[PDB]
Amino acid sequence: MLTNSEKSRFFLADLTGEVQSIPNTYGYISNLGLFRSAPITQTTFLMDLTDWD
Amino acid sequence: VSLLDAVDRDSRKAETSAPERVRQISFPMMYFKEVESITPDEIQGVRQPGTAN
Secondary structure, eight states: OEEEOSSOTTSEEEOOOOOOOOOOOOOOHHHHTOSOOOOOSSSOOOOOOOOOO | OOOOOOOOTTSOOOOOOOOOOOOOOOOOOOOOOOOOOOOGGGTTTOOOTTOOO
16 A cells, blocks of 8 residues: 655655564463462451461 | 311310300380360350351
């Protein structure tokens, strides 16, 4: 598709498209599946710890 | 036991074995004891650690 030339408005040149650069993302741990999903309905949670020897 | 030594048949000699020995011993023994008890006050109103009610 044609566009205006570099140094004249009365002459046309051909445009061949675009090339895009996208930043790198890694996300390795997120794919291992180590972390389970535990949705909750509150803004805090508790736990109990038991010990003996 | 032990090896014999040579002897001349016209200068006759003889060896002899030493007597057998006997011995005796004795042993004591070890004693272990443990004690525990249960009382109602350990159950009255004690919440289970892993549950709410």
